[model samples]
Target chain A: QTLTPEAATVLNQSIAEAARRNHGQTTPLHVAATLLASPAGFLRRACIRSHPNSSHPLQCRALELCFSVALERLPTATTTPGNDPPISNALMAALKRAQAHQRRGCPEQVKVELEQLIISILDDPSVSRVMREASFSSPAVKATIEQSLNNDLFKKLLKGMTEKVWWQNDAAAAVAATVSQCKLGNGKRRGVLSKGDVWLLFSGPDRVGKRKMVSALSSLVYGTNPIMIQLGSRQDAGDGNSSFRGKTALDKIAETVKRSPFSVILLEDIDEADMLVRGSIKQAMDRGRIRDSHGREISLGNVIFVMTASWHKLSLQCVPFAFHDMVSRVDDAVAFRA
Target chain B: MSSIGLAHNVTILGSGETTVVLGHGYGTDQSVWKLLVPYLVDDYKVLLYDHMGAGTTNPDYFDFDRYSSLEGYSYDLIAILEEFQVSKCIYVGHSMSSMAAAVASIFRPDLFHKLVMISPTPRLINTEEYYGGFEQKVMDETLRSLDENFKSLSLGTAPLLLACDLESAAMQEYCRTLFNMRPDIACCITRMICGLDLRPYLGHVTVPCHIIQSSNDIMVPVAVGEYLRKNLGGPSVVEVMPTEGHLPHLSMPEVTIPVVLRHIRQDIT
Candidate 1:
């Protein structure tokens, strides 16, 4: 959801409160960083989407404080050989204006001004030298400045200039190249059209990424291709009938494997994969077969399982098994560790 | 004595000729004193209250301005004591609350007979000249992890009681607790805990002091206990319990309870 002026005010207030708590030393840039990390998806997205305008009121306050702190800490810019003058008032003011535009949801304006500010800061000999030499005691302040310098807003701005068709074609060609190179092993070459070689497990913290990963994997693989199985939440598995129903999703996976001996079953976030789906995978892997709804035996020995999960959960799961053994058994366990 | 409004949910437990107030540490509410309550309640009309951010209290009652620091909490404790007309009491504190208790004692020594500091440390950050238990980098990393995956971490790091697996459960539980905290409140509390360095004020502790330390606490190391002992001016005793872990009262109450009871009984006798 787009951030309304009212919502912007709320966000700004939240930022201000955070800054005041940090001993009046917090900056607008820091506030923006905090907002980007906010649990409120809309707020966070808005912050990035809008660029500087999504910057909060408190962030402005914090930037001002940072400037003051910098000045107080390094009083003489030239007299002190090492210490540089604090961030200038003109630059700080320009940053605030850029941030104000970003908050207003004017992405184009936000992007232009943000890039200009970054360039100005980088190009200004005095500002550049000071920033380089300045030893900020506060890590947060330093991180904010660094992030602002490496501004993703400008990157997004540049991306906006690219043609959709050109981007899509480039992406597709890149995916094809990657898939062709990484798809097969040396021993017995198995094509995506072959039976049970790989089952790409597509999963992510969110639905969009899962869909994108699965779609991309499918486009790169031909024939019976990679089976896409959606694992529902734990609540879906709670009902007495739900277990049987949940098995249907896994059944589809088994069917695909049976049709293609060398198939990849893609499951997203296997750590979040429901017990039923996991049980099915375990059964298939351990027994070298999976039972379809029609009581058909599907060979699982050749089916590859690729799953995505956060590194922490992946580590937790791997700890129980002998790493070498587990790693060896999976023909290709492609893990996208976030 | 400093005065501040007490949230409604807190049940002040003890009352004595000389009132001895007790405060619990992090990850717990006043209910943690279920074991010590029987001992103190009979002799001293005890005052018990949950910190605003803790369990069952109106989450709305957590005023970021009022409860920003342990100083705010210390003020609340002193307010309760003064409101009850208790002239002076022994102040007993556990974990970080020990810092709060000390602050209160310093602010109003006339209101305290003695300061019983349990697992006390003025700062958790390790300074060049001081060993405050936690290294600055460690504290920063811990805080960073908390900030990043507060909810998931809490769920993964459930308290040991609820945890089958230590690391996972602890992270989960920690995440849950971290999310339970209002962001503003959490930020303020974290700042207060990290920024604090009360070593300078240790000598200002006017009342008789007793420091009860766990033999093995990762959070409050034995060295910290010794440091507190050396710093405080009032006649102080360093009693090390056989218990291990940061939350001995929760992890090994059988060991911590009796020792605390004996101390209370001795004071009464």
Candidate 2:
């Protein structure tokens, strides 16, 4: 009776993606584009295997590019502000048919899976006609589905047998020891396998060791350079751009947080940031989730937030009144000395 | 600081002994009466408020059980009138609002002096020996599509019924209001409004009534207006405006505004 979590995410993504392109309606092609855009999803694997020449990987990429062009050729409808792009009848009918198939399937499975949605898209006569014209067909997709299913299903079954791993810092051994003892949940308890993100505040004078500490922290958590945002820059200005072609600085931060959960992020010059960024940071620290301008909720769970502020004042009481609430929400505050 | 006024975002305009409560239909708020309000307010104390589930109102106030029937909306109307201390007033209702006002009149007919219904229908689904406009299968499809894909149904239907250019200011205004509705609330309200049969309750509506219908409404046909006039247990008259679409007051305001004012004055032949 309900769609699987992945299926629901895909549907929302299709709607958002259509709205991004100013498309009037979210048609089956929109859903196909969403499915095809997934980096390593099973649908893409199926798409690749079903290609006429599987040896040439560019063949699969070309197929997707061709479909995107076809999507652009379809006429767009005028839209009013503050409204999401509407779903088309073709997409709605396809989803309904998919749900019906789920109801008739084995009673053991209650939710309509994403694979079912793919099959439903292929079943639509008009949509399939378009796909056939683009050198794609349902039979090819369906024929390769079983093989892709076998591979994906086999890997999922073995996921539980993998070894456990935990992140630890090697460079800043002393600071790492203090951070490891912070009260944040490590998700190792018997029942608590998920917990909110960790917030750390690093305060020090200019040319101190704050940056070094953050560098060490990022290597341990994300094993790569952290997403750094310079808040006081003109680029961080709120939706003041005339064209709306580029993402706002706040949106860029939110998107990075959403895509890379459990990764370390650096917020440099926290004191120089404006009220909007401060409020969003404070709220995200408290709620472990924040909504972007596009109305998408980005969960902060498992993320390690590393914020650096040059505290030459050397007085905790002298901390800016704006971030007074933010300091209280920090899970751990570390002092960096030269 | 009265919560009742704040909850519905009630606004009172103009001044007069008689208060004219402008009740908007589904997929719209009090703003739908923007063009017609000025004409009436100068002569009457006009009242306006958003329905509980309307986009202009707080979604937290929407109660599925309370709004499962029209009685909840009827009660809200009574409460608002009581808050304003109106003993007798003119009520102008559109679409589903006309039915809500009828339900209110059934319980407290003394509170209303005259009732005006624009594009009203007692029932939408057809029954035995009755052509309520739509069939059972059609209503089912509408309900399913609305529930599953509200944005699509709203976007597809609003422009189709506007009878104006898609980019026209009126159409865009109407579409924005329709689009602002939350999907689940829109679905529930549609299900409640479409499935209702107000025919049985019309007999209790003893207030003087006037039906203002468009000559060619895709949603509520002219026959439904005749049906309402024939069934209402009160002195009623029907003025079929020569216009297109379900929302003549919105789409053909030039013609509907004057007729509405005439009927509100009760100076008809």
Best of the candidates, TM-score:
2
After TM-score superposition, the amount by which residue A272's alpha carbon in candidate 2 deviates from its true location, in angstroms, is 66
DockQ of each: 0.02, 0.01
The candidates score, on chain A by TM-score, as follows 0.32, 0.41
lDDT of 1 by residue, B175-212 (tens): 23433454445555666778877888889876766778
The TM-score values for the models, in the order shown, are 0.39, 0.41
Candidate 1 per-residue lDDT over residues A1-338, each given as its tens digit: 13455444534554454433343332333333333344452333322333354255554344345445543453222232222223246546545654564556445543333333333233334433443333212333334543554653223322322222233333333333334434443222333433334433222234444445444444434434455554434223222132223234455567666666665566545565544456566656545678653457776655446665433212335433423343344433333323
Shift of residue B42 alpha carbon in model 2, Å = 1.7
Residue A17, model 1: Cα distance from true site in angstroms: 60
Supply the global lDDT for candidate 1. Answer: 0.52
In candidate 2, stretches whose alpha carbon ends up further than 4 angstroms from where it belongs are A1-338, B150-180, B267-269
